[PDB]
């Protein structure tokens, strides 16, 4: 056998489901099939002003031999995935630090400084979050496997006493659920690398609420908070303010993909990720222009969504996307 084509897009009964209702499921489980993103919004109870952002990343990615590359698809608005590689056969250590890869249009959307993050958008809510790795290696030099599993990483707090002379007690942001990255989860997908993958995430809550935009978070744990304090297994740096950051944490299980290329492997793929967000636009922002009302309750779209997601394999090979 051999490698799957690459989804090109924007190249110039089932009646019970409402129009926006259908477009919602479509975007939610299979965006690569459409030339254009059907998504309009979340067909739930809320019918307020929102601008449905349609994020897509086309990223060339070389997996370096004799290492396991870890990719996290987390519900962090504006950044597509977090990557890191470690010595083959191992997992991230406290020492590890995942650096973020942005979706195009980050600064345009979130600014170029840590407290400038909600200048145009006050809150958001995910509608969809999918990944697709399309190997671009030749059938003679690739080697390794691709493994997908999903973790329920949530953003909580850590309360810890400090040795400040008036003497205080601290409370800082902390990612809970990150130890999930530390082992291949029992419910997982594993296959030959030269077969790629395509997996998706679904809302991890009985409904679809709005998460708030967060100001001033660059690294997590935050500066002057050690990795042992925060109780996290590793780090997530978003770099310079001017570049990126962690502007929120939506309600989607994060997808973990581990590429594993033995020595002498030539593994390269095209990484594509889609995430459909519903944002609350600010009257002062220009995107406000493109705002529309979130579609109305589609009880059938909403239940079908739940059942479909539960009937789908944790991951599927490219060819079948």
């Amino acid at each position: 056998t051999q490698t799957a084509p690459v989804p090109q897009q924007n190249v110039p009964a089932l009646t019970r489901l409402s129009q926006p209702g259908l477009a919602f499921l479509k975007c939610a489980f299979a965006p690569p099939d459409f030339n254009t993103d059907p998504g309009k919004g979340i067909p739930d109870r809320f019918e307020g002003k929102v601008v449905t952002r349609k994020d897509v990343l086309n990223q060339s990615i070389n997996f370096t031999a004799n290492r396991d590359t870890f990719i996290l698809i987390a519900p962090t608005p504006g950044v597509a995935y977090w990557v890191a590689d470690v010595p083959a056969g191992t997992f991230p250590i406290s020492t590890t630090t995942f650096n973020a890869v942005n979706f195009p249009g980050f600064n345009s959307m979130f600014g170029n400084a840590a407290a400038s993050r909600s200048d145009q958008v006050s809150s958001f809510r995910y509608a969809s979050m999918n990944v697709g790795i399309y190997p671009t290696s030749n059938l003679m030099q690739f080697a390794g496997s691709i493994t997908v599993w999903k973790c329920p990483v949530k953003l909580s707090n850590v309360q810890f006493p400090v040795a400040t002379t008036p003497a205080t007690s601290a409370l800082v942001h902390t990612l809970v659920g990150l130890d999930g990255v530390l082992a291949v989860g029992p419910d997982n997908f594993s296959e030959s690398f030269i077969k790629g993958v395509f997996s998706q995430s679904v809302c991890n809550e009985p409904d679809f609420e709005f998460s708030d935009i967060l100001e001033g978070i660059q690294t997590l744990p935050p500066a002057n908070v050690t990795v042992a304090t925060s109780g996290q297994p590793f780090n997530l740096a978003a770099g310079a303010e001017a570049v990126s950051g962690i502007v929120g944490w939506g309600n989607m299980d994060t997808i973990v993909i581990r590429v594993s290329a033995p020595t002498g492997a030539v593994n390269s793929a095209i990484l594509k990720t889609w995430a459909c967000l519903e944002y609350r636009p600010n009257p002062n922002a220009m995107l406000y222009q493109f705002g529309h009302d979130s579609p109305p309750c589609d009880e059938v779209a909403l239940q079908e969504y739940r059942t479909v997601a539960r009937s789908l394999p944790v991951a599927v090979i490219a060819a079948q996307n």
Binding site: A13, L14, L25, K26, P32, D33, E304, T307, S311, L312
Partner: peptide, 16 residues
């Protein structure tokens, strides 16, 4: 085959 193809079939089955 496609993901949507499968999703479509699933939806149909559940609806009937």
């Amino acid at each position: 085959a496609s993901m949507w193809e499968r999703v479509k079939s699933i939806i149909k089955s559940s609806l009937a």
